[PDB]
A paper describes a structure:
[name], which is the prototype of poxviruses, encodes a [name] (vvUDG) that is significantly different from the UDGs of other organisms in primary, secondary and tertiary structure and characteristic motifs. It adopted a novel catalysis-independent role in DNA replication that involves interaction with a viral protein, A20, to form the processivity factor. [name]:A20 association is essential for assembling of the processive DNA polymerase complex. The overall structure of the vvUDG protein in both crystal forms is similar. vvUDG adopts an α/β fold described as DNA glycosylase fold in the SCOP database that is composed of a parallel β-sheet of 4 strands (order 2134) with 3 layers of α/β/α.
We have determined the crystal structure of recombinant vvUDG by SIRAS phasing in trigonal space group P3221. The structure was refined to an R value of 24.1% (Rfree of 29.9%) at 2.4 Å resolution. The recombinant protein used for crystallization contained an N-terminal His-tag. The final model consists of two subunits A and B with a total number of 440 protein residues (subunit A: residues -1 to 171, 174 to 186 and 189 to 218; B: -8 to 172, 174 to 186 and 189 to 218), 1 chloride and 1 sulfate ion, 146 water, 4 glycerol (GOL) and 3 imidazole (IMD) molecules. The packing of vvUDG in the unit cell of the trigonal form gives rise to a second type of dimer (type II) formed by subunits that are related by crystallographic 2-fold symmetry. In subunit A an imidazole molecule occupies the active site making interactions with D68 and displaying hydrophobic contacts with F79. Protein regions at the type I dimer interface only observed in the trigonal crystal form may be involved in the binding of A20.
Residue numbers in the entry:
A (entry chain A), B (entry chain A): -1 to 171, 174 to 186, 189 to 218
């Protein structure tokens, strides 16, 4: 069924997750306990209470995963790409791409987490405040475990960042696009890489309406 | 440089390979020796002398990998998908897709191994005469090793067969399309999946001219 379950750890001490994540929660508890103490030492983005909040998303209704390597170095919320005040460069560049693709001119913000069929994801679920990929060693196996579970549900995996994702062993056993980082210099590639996965969808599944992410 | 090197085994006893495959040849010798005796027991497709002939292809000039799970159950040549007399269903269906995409009406045959930028590949390099995926257990680690090496060179990995490739742990560390099997029942998906990877190319690399495969 569709429900939220619960599991015990140490800081945030309790992880609430949607039913769909069950197959993975036993190993995630094992992995997090042997790692948390090394991890919690630093000021993190997001705060420990927000590490796993994205596990409250169902995967049954997801067909696309938009994956960044890790949360914003500062002001991370626990929801990947989310910037509640729309000041973070990465989500502003995605918004502009979508704006250009769809034809939507006016908007106050953009959020990938409110689009039907889309789960936004952070490969590593944290980093030390102000330092990208700084907690990579701690999430290692957890990261592989959770992306393995996601790619069983979603049809398209869209990774943002070529060098960010350059050395990452991961899943075995679907359609992957390794596009540029949203804040890359030189546009056509960014914008076409988001239009290209609705036609990868067409081969079987329903399209994504990327404009559902716009906040007015 | 660009040259063909040589390595020692036991049946076919000698493996000739292009320079580009060097990083992988030490492990492939280790892996093949501990496996060959179990493998050579059966009548195979292709014959042992043809197992590794596709290692004579450079990878430096390859941007697309078209991957089947293993050679034809009968009449395999050592070159993936190749049917010298154009009677095998899989290559005839690919040819028809290309014919429909390109506009080429008349041809005697089709070969993926004569297209610039394309390396055709068999995940498992053999099978028992008349039985698909029958030598899967023997190639296991070798298969992972060689596809790992290919995907470092190519920009697009195109796998043909959803259930054929359903349970396959593989590479870590690029753009993957898991399309249908060429001999699938119900066409648009087959043909669009081959037109879709030239635009995945466009994001960075030169296009593939699929019509280069036609034999007149
Ligand atoms: Cl984030
Ligand atoms: Cl073959």
């Amino acid at each position: 069924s569709h429900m939220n379950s619960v599991t015990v750890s140490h800081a945030p001490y309790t992880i609430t997750y949607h039913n769909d994540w069950e197959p993975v929660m036993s190993q995630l508890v094992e992995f997090y306990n042997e790692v948390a103490s090394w991890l919690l030492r630093d000021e993190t983005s997001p705060i420990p209470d927000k590490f796993f909040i994205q596990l409250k998303q169902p995967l049954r209704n997801k067909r696309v995963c938009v994956c960044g390597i890790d949360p914003y170095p500062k002001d991370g919320t626990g929801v990947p790409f989310e910037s509640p005040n729309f000041t973070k460069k990465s989500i502003k560049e995605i918004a502009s791409s979508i704006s250009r693709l769809t034809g939507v001119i006016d908007y106050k913000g953009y959020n990938l987490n409110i689009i039907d069929g889309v789960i936004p994801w952070n490969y590593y679920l944290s980093c030390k405040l102000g330092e990208t990929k700084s907690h990579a060693i701690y999430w290692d196996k957890i990261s592989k475990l959770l992306l393995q579970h996601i790619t069983k549900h979603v049809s398209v995996l869209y990774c943002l960042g070529k060098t960010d994702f350059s050395n990452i062993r991961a899943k075995l056993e679907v359609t992957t696009i390794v596009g540029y980082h949203p804040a890359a210099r030189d546009f056509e590639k960014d914008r076409s890489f988001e239009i290209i996965n609705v036609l990868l969808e067409l081969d079987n599944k329903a399209p994504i309406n990327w404009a559902q992410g716009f906040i007015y």
